[PDB]
């Protein structure tokens, strides 16, 4: 095996389609366990101002009870056979996946139908979950990372559904009724926008039979979203009582398909990530990370590439003390402009290797593989095989990075969200002026 035969030997994910539009997809393997899940194309991006937060509410109510399985009965099946049921709802996706033994695949799929098709949405359950969601919102206020990322989305996609948080405003939480949830599950859990994805030791024929036997009686065969408008701005939630100051600066990134995703990730891999409790520190080849470790500017930073269907945020988020925001912002902008102006071959090779490690290591275990299947089928319309990813990364070079970063970073108005003791944070004019070089 020379890593080429290795990639070629990865089992192929068969994809089918029911009459309802259910894209049944599976990736057989040898493990005795499996992860079977349903990926919905619902999320806050598809929610108006009044309906905002209904997706999170429905996700919460999903596992409580079903019409066929009243209340804890649904729970009882999950634990009694050792399965781990879980759900996650981001801004443009929802998913319910049940990790279970390959033997129990016939049962799990049935449950996966019951959770998605025949929910309960009981009124007393709605009241209890309303209280729980309120306390969970007060929890989410605690950590600065999620708060800062929601601020970034609000100030970058202001005036668009993308600005809406996943959980929604607390006002909507109290004022969401059972009718709204029923309408949401009726008009957003439709059959065409569904991916039943399974990994592990499941054969595609059995998955197709189970889907055709349990998911057949679903929707037949509309809120198809609108292109959101990036609006470079800044939000400063100056709160000096917080210990550290979380900043996130992002530019309008690429879409989901948008082949420029492959170079940009490589470019981001050049900047990398770092925090206090790392290893080499002052020797890590990422110049920004080496500077941070040498001068102890920050307790953390990372480069994110949040990309949605038609747009996306590409940038960096760092956590540092109250009197190092300016220096680290300068060094971050310097790394960005260096990549746009002069990328150099060696850094590009390091980025290519790092991205190869990302894609390969991320796709291990049944849960990440099934998640990749669902997300790829929903976004790319296919499952990009690892060989295709390898070829696309191989095509990347110094010139490609220098051009792609230039198209997205150089002289672009960024969106900034800072929270905490952010007095040091440079004024938006200084940040914007950092995007361009008078030497270049």
């Amino acid at each position: 095996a020379t890593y080429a035969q290795a990639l070629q030997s990865v089992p192929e994910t068969q994809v089918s389609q029911l009459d309802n539009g259910l894209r049944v997809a599976s990736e057989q393997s040898s493990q005795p366990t499996c992860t079977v899940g349903v990926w919905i194309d619902a999320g806050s991006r598809y929610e108006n101002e009044k309906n905002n937060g209904a997706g999170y509410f429905v996700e919460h109510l999903a596992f409580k009870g079903t019409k066929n399985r009243p209340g804890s009965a649904l729970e009882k099946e999950v634990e009694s056979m050792g399965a781990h049921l879980n759900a996650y709802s981001t801004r443009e996706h929802t998913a319910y996946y049940i990790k279970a033994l390959s033997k129990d695949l016939p049962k799990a799929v049935e449950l996966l139908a019951d959770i998605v098709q025949n929910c309960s949405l009981e009124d007393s359950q709605i009241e209890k979950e309303r209280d729980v969601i309120l306390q969970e919102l007060q929890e989410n206020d605690s950590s600065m990372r999620d708060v800062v990322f929601d601020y970034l989305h609000a100030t970058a996609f202001q005036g668009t559904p993308l600005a809406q948080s996943v959980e929604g405003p607390s006002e909507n939480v109290r004022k969401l009724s059972r009718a709204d949830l029923t309408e949401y599950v009726s008009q957003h859990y439709k059959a065409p926008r569904m991916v039943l994805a399974a990994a592990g030791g499941v054969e595609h024929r059995q998955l197709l039979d189970l889907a055709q036997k349990h998911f057949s009686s679903l929707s037949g065969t509309v809120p198809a979203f609108t292109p959101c408008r990036f609006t470079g701005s800044e939000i400063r939630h100056r709160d000096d009582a917080l210990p550290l100051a979380h900043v996130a600066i992002a530019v309008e990134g690429p879409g989901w398909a948008n082949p420029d995703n492959v170079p940009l990730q490589v470019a981001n891999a050049i900047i990398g990530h770092y925090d206090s409790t790392y290893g080499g520190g002052t020797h890590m080849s990422s110049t920004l990370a080496s500077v941070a470790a040498t001068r102890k500017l920050c307790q953390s930073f990372q480069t994110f590439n949040i990309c949605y269907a038609e747009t996306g945020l590409l940038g960096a988020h760092f956590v540092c003390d109250n009197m190092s925001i300016d220096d680290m912002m300068f060094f971050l902008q310097g790394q960005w402009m260096r990549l746009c102006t002069s990328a150099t071959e060696s850094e590009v090779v390091r980025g290519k290797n790092i991205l190869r490690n990302a894609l390969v290591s991320h796709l291990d275990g049944t849960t990440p593989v099934c998640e990749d299947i669902g997300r790829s089928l929903l976004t790319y319309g296919r499952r990009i095989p690892l060989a295709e990813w390898e070829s696309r990364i191989a095509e990347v070079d110094a010139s490609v990075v220098r051009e792609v970063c230039s198209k997205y970073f150089y002289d672009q108005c960024p969106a900034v969200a800072g929270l905490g003791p952010i007095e040091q944070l440079p004024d938006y004019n200084r940040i914007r002026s950092g995007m361009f070089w008078l030497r270049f």
Binding site: P426, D427, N429, R430
Partner: protein, 54 residues
């Protein structure tokens, strides 16, 4: 607010306005704020009709 991105350009505008006034003065009416008797060689034996300072 930081001085450079804002007050440098504000001061540039102020300097432009002051240059406008000064250049108007010099180019169009130079001997407006002066006194014509200053264009006479100093003669200690005779004084001008009025002795006013600037």
């Amino acid at each position: 607010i930081p001085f450079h991105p804002y007050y440098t350009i504000k001061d540039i505008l102020g300097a432009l306005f002051m240059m406008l006034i000064l250049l108007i003065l010099v180019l169009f009416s130079p001997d407006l704020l002066g006194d014509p008797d200053n264009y006479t060689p100093a003669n200690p034996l005779n004084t001008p009709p009025h002795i006013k300072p600037e």
